């Protein structure tokens, strides 16, 4: 009876667990999680208006209810239980704890109220306990997001969607309340490179273009000669560039021109601009603008770099959201860590110089992957682990698994949240969504959750 442990209950932990249970008929898998609830960024990252994306929770829930899987929420690995303790208790340990640190802008003015990481703003509207009191001031009329990826689009979309259109989503009642009173009518998504370097994907881009009550603001000048540089582009990429190109350059028909004219909100793309400094309001109490350095591109293809021209532009705004990069956090002394890449050094999932220690997901490969990428990558780790297990490369015979860890946790006063405990909270959240017509009404207060989890 192989004993395997997984650290983190996001997509990487769950898909690694699913692979192990599917391919090994006897292995037992325990999933440890620091939050009181499972699912990671599927719950706290994926937007409320993208419920379809969250459906992977149904297969995760089937794995968690299986006889050979157990969940241990409210257990912070590296604090409540050490990695060495897990290594001593299990035949293999898989680190799947994501990339929790958001990269700071590292620019003057970043401290001004009104400046936030995009992921923290997302955590706020998604009920992540640590961002519950983010209290973003939406009394300004314009928001600026730095970085042209899908997270940027999610924030822009949430800020500009007519609030009534979010009523039947699982967005928090607290954030929806704040959104109804928001004065934000304009959102700029700024990148230091050009149109060909955007990181957004087409579903999300089209959602933005077609968002009811809004109009797109694209400068045709930024797209000069694009059709020409995309003729040898990969299909998906070319399709995305053609959609941008049409939006920027095609004169709309009568009906669309009218719809755009009557739109009270707008969003746009700004290119070749790098964040230099956040400007304060006259009394220094809040952000009043962003000073950007004009850039120009050098290099060819993927090696293109933005270099400063010397010119600067001041763009007025009351909200500045940074949406560019994340790094893993060091978790424990027994685990090697690469501070530059912000990952646990590894070779195809095997942690460098640590027999029996593996990694999957963002902590394995960096934060570039989407859920599907995370899923296949976790299957790669799962294969290497199972082959190592089958080969007799991990400890022989007995390993106590949770029997040993629970004896430690019992003595430390740590009471883990089981999957059945989570089902209790899940049922409560879903029932609370019944009156308001939502999928659920997330509990935000950790203490109230502990009561509702049976603790």
Q: Which residues are documented as binding site for NADP(+)?
A: 148-151, 192-193, 204, 369
Out of 23, 78, 222, 393, the only residue in the binding site for ligand FAD (CB under 6 A) is 78
Q: CB of residue 61 vs ligand FAD: minimum separation in angstroms? A: 15
Task: Decide if 48 contacts 123 (C-beta within 8 A).
Answer: no
Residue range at the interface with ligand FAD (CB under 6 A); choices 5-13, 163-171, 278-286, 402-410: 5-13
- The site that binds ligand FAD (CB under 6 A) totals a number of residues, namely 35
Instruction: Compute the least distance from the CB of residue 44 to ligand FAD, in Å.
Output: 8
Asked if 97 touches ligand FAD (CB under 6 A), the answer is yes
154 is catalytic: yes
**Which listed residue (2, 13, 195, 275) binds ligand FAD by CB under 6 A?**
13
Residue 12 binds ligand FAD (CB under 6 A): yes
Among 292, 371, 389, 443, indicate the residue that binds ligand FAD (CB under 6 A). 371
**Residue 237: exposure state from Cβ atoms within 10 A (0-12, 13-18, ≥19):** middle
Report yes or no: 169 and 442 within 8 Å, Cβ to Cβ: no
Site mask for ligand FAD (CB under 6 A), range 396-435, x = bound: ----------------------------------------
> Among 173, 170, 129, which residue's Cα sits nearest to residue 37?
129
Q: 214: helix, coil or strand? A: strand
Q: Which of 33, 170, 421, 426 binds ligand FAD (CB under 6 A)?
A: 33
> Is 393 annotated in the active site?
no
Choices 18-26, 39-47, 272-280, 403-411 (CB under 6 A): range interacting with ligand FAD: 39-47
Select from 26-34, 270-278, 389-397, 418-426 the region that touches ligand FAD (CB under 6 A): 26-34
Helix pair 56-64, 11-23: axis angle to 10 deg:
50
Task: Copy the structure tokens of residue 282.
Answer: 């006259």
CA distances in angstroms from 233 to 22, 239, 271, 330, listed in the order given: 38, 9, 20, 39
Query: What per-residue string of b and e applies to 178-202 under the rule 16 or more CB within 10 Å gives b?
Result: bbeebebbbbbbbbbbbbbebbbeb
> How many residues belong to the chain?
455
Of 149, 117, 157, 152, the closest CA to residue 136 belongs to 117
Tell me whether strands 101-102 and 287-298 are parallel, antiparallel or unpaired. Answer: unpaired
For residues 120 and 430, which CB has a smaller minimum distance to ligand FAD in the complex? 120
Q: In degrees rounded to 5, what are phi and psi of residue 246?
A: -60, -45
Q: With binding defined as CB under 6 A, does residue 45 bind ligand FAD?
A: yes
Considering only residues 154 through 173, tell me which ones interact with ligand FAD, judged by CB under 6 A.
Answer: 154
Give me 58's structure tokens: 């149904």
The span from the CA of 189 to the CA of 267, in Å, is 8
Question: Is residue 50 at the binding interface for ligand FAD, with CB under 6 A as the rule?
Answer: yes
Using CA atoms, how far apart are residues 128 and 229, in angstroms rounded to an integer? 42
Q: Interface residues with ligand FAD (CB under 6 A)?
A: 7-13, 32-35, 40-41, 45-46, 50, 53, 76-78, 96-98, 100, 119, 122, 151, 154, 331, 361-362, 369-371, 374
Q: Which residues are catalytically annotated?
A: 50, 154, 371-372
């Amino acid at each position: 009876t192989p004993q395997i442990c997984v650290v983190g209950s996001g997509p990487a932990g769950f898909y690694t667990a699913q692979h192990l249970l599917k391919h090994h008929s006897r292995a037992h898998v325990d999933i440890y999680e620091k939050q009181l609830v499972p699912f990671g960024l599927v719950r706290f990252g994926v937007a409320p208006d993208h419920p379809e994306v969250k459906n992977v929770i149904n297969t995760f829930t089937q794995t968690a209810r299986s006889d050979r899987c157990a969940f241990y929420g409210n257990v912070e690995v590296g604090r409540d239980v050490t990695v060495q303790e897990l290594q001593d208790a299990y035949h293999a340990v898989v680190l799947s704890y994501g990339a929790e640190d958001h990269q700071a802008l590292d620019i003057p003015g970043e401290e001004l109220p009104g400046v936030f990481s995009a992921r923290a703003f997302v955590g706020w509207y998604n009920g992540l306990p640590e961002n519950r009191e983010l209290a973003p001031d939406l009394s300004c009329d314009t928001a600026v997001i730095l970085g042209q990826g899908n997270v940027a689009l999610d924030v822009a979309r949430i800020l500009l969607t007519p609030p009534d259109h979010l009523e039947k989503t699982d967005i928090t009642e607290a954030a929806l309340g704040a959104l109804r009173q928001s004065r934000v009518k304009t959102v700029w998504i700024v990148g230091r490179r050009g149109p060909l370097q955007v990181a957004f994907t087409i579903k999300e881009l089209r959602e933005m273009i077609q968002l009811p009550g809004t109009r797109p603001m694209l400068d045709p000048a930024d797209f000069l000669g694009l059709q020409d540089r995309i003729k040898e582009a990969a299909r998906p990429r070319k399709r995305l560039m053609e959609l941008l190109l049409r939006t920027a350059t095609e004169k709309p028909g009568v009906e669309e021109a009218a719809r755009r004219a009557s739109a009270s909100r707008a969003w746009g793309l700004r290119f070749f601009r790098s964040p230099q400094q956040v400007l304060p309001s006259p009394d220094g109490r809040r952000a009043a603008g962003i000073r950007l350095a004009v850039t120009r591109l050098e290099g060819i293809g993927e090696a293109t770099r933005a270099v400063p021209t010397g010119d600067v532009e001041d763009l007025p705004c009351g909200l500045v959201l940074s949406s560019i990069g994340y790094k893993s956090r060091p978790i424990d002394p027994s685990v090697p860590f690469d501070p530059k890449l912000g990952v646990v050094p590894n070779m195809e999932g095997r942690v460098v110089d640590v027999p029996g220690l593996y990694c999957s997901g963002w902590v394995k490969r960096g934060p570039t992957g989407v859920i599907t990428t995370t899923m296949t990558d976790s299957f790669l780790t799962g294969q290497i682990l199972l082959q190592d297990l089958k080969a007799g490369h991990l400890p022989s015979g007995p390993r106590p698994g949770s029997a040993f860890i629970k004896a430690l946790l019992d003595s430390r006063g740590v009471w883990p949240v089981s999957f059945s405990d989570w089902e209790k909270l899940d049922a409560e959240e879903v029932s609370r969504g019944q009156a308001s017509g939502k999928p659920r009404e997330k509990l935000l207060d950790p203490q109230e959750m502990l009561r509702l989890l049976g603790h």
